[PDB]
């Protein structure tokens, strides 16, 4: 009967959907750390600087 | 059926969207404190100064 064949494919459908879910989570986690670090590094880059007061010679 | 697979990926889609939301909030909060402090420090920097009145010798 059709009942047996339906159950077999059902298991396969669940496993496939889990794979595509894993890709999206892993990619978002990788891009999270890069975007956070870039923002913090740029903030330090703009604000920091050195200034010359006076120059003397002998 | 397609109904089972749709629900599994749906959960994953919601979790991924939450991650990207967290990045934007955290970055804006970090840049908030830097921009506020820079403005206040510069205002004090320009306004403050010392002046010499008179010099006497013995």
> How close does chain B come to A58, measured CA to CA in Å?
27
What string of H, E and C letters represents the secondary structure of chain B? CHHHHHHHHHHHHHHHHHHHHHHHHHHHHHHHHHHHHHHHHHHHHHHCCCCCCCCCCC
Contact between chains at B27 and A18 (C-beta distance less than 8 A): no
Interface mutation vs chain B, best among A9, A28, A35, most B CBs within 10 Å = A28
The structure was resolved to a resolution in Å of: 2.5
The chain B residue lying nearest A42, using CA atoms, is: B31
Separation of alpha carbons A31 and A9, rounded Å:
34
Give, in degrees to the nearest 5, the angle at Cα A7 between A2 and A9: 95
CB B29 within 8 A of CB A37: no
Contacts from B36-42 at CB under 8 Å and sequence distance 24+? B38/A47
User: Counting one residue from A and one from B, how many pairs have CB atoms under 8 Å apart?
Assistant: 48
Among A47, A36, A48, smallest CA distance to B28 is for A36
Helices A2-47 and B2-47 cross at an angle (nearest 10°) of 10
């Amino acid at each position: 009967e059709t009942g047996i064949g339906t159950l077999i494919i059902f298991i396969a459908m669940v496993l496939v959907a889990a794979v595509a879910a894993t890709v999206l989570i892993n990619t978002a986690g990788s891009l999270q750390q890069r975007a956070t670090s870039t923002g913090s590094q740029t903030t330090n880059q703009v604000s920091t600087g050195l200034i010359v007061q006076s120059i003397y010679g002998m």
